[model samples]
Target: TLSILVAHDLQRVIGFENQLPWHLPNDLKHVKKLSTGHTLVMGRKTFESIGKPLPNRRNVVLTSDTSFNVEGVDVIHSIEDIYQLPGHVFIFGGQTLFEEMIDKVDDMYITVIEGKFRGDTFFPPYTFEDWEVASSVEGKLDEKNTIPHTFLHLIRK
Candidate 1:
């Protein structure tokens, strides 16, 4: 199984500076749960933003710069390197990497944050023509979090 996991606001804004803009605990927990046993593929910048390998997941870093390397991560020079691997692979992001892997991955697990947010980075432009909503669950704004959100499961059509 191949999938991409991401959280974004109404504007498709996924990041501000080098990190996520909102503090959504449930969304974070969902990510951890979904990616726990999968192989995580991400860009070098994304890896840097995360700061360390997430426990229990295989870390694969894609970098154009061959010299860029991190301890405990399998560094691959191109996105093709990831395509050759067999197994559940989850493409976590920093934008560009998501764009590159969008067509190659099988499904998307998206968390839609329920409000507008200021951001410098956004999810890549994509159309629904190639995908269909498989399932969705609505989340409420409550004492625990400020933003109401939706968890969407999308599969290629």
Candidate 2:
């Protein structure tokens, strides 16, 4: 099964200037816990933002540029190439890749931040028509970050 993990604000703003706009440690922890020890597939820009392959995981990058290379990442030209990857795979993202893989996603783990944020990139539009919320948790407010959050686990029907 394939799962996707993302953190976005109420407006669905995900990124700004090719970077995470918020500083949320717990959110990062959630990402680490879920994505660790698995295949992490992402677009070239997302990989670039992360700067290096996350340790202890197989990093697969989808890029049309054949010359785009990173020491620790396996490069693939298309979504079909992702099918050949072994084991559980998680699609982490930049917006474009998420849109590309939306139909193929089997599950989703989303962290919705409490505030409206300024961002140029957004998650693709989606509906719950074919999915069910498996679980959700209300997060505690972080004094420093000044934001409350929630996590949702959704499974496709």
Candidate 3:
């Protein structure tokens, strides 16, 4: 199965200078829980932003640079290569990767924060008309995670 995992604010802002705009430990934990045992596919820039391969998961970096290689992750040159990866695959981001893969994902896990944020990158414009909400839950506010957010699971119809 192919899925997209992402967090965006009310304005659909996802990044600020190549990093997440806000600090939400709960959201980080949520990402780890879902992607730990699955394959994570992201663009080279996203991998760079993360700095290293996340532990306990298969990391696949997609880049057009044939010679661009990272020590711990699989480097693939084409998007088609993702289809052959065994088991579930989750596409994380960098704007380009999301734009390219949006039409191909079977479902999506979206965390929508309550407020607008300052960001240089935005999630691609998409209509949810063909998708159905599979699950949704409100995130609780805490000292560490002050923002109100909602986690939504959307499946393509």
Which candidate achieves the best TM-score against the true structure? Answer: 3
lDDT of 1 by residue, 109-131 (tens): 99989889999878876677888
Q: Which ranking of candidates, highest TM-score first?
A: 3, 2, 1
Give the alpha-carbon lDDT of every model.
0.86, 0.88, 0.92
Off by over 4 Å in 2: 143-145
Off by over 4 Å in 3: none
What clash count does candidate 2 reach? 0
- For candidate 3, the clash count comes to 0
> In candidate 3, what are the lDDT values of residues 52-133, reduced to their tens digit?
9999999999998988877779999999999999998999997889999999999999999888998998888777798899
Ten residues in sequence with the least summed lDDT for candidate 3? 122-131
lDDT of 1: 0.86
Which has the better TM-score: candidate 1, or candidate 3? Answer: 3
The better-scoring model by lDDT among 1 and 2 is 2
Task: Write candidate 2's Cα lDDT for 119-147 as tens digits.
Answer: 99899887889779999998776665557
What's the CA error at residue 66 for candidate 2, in Å? 1.2
With candidate 2 superimposed using the best TM-score fit, by how many Å does residue 48's alpha carbon deviate from the native?
0.9
What candidate 1 gets wrong by more than 4 Å, as runs, is: none
Candidates ranked, most accurate by lDDT first: 3, 2, 1
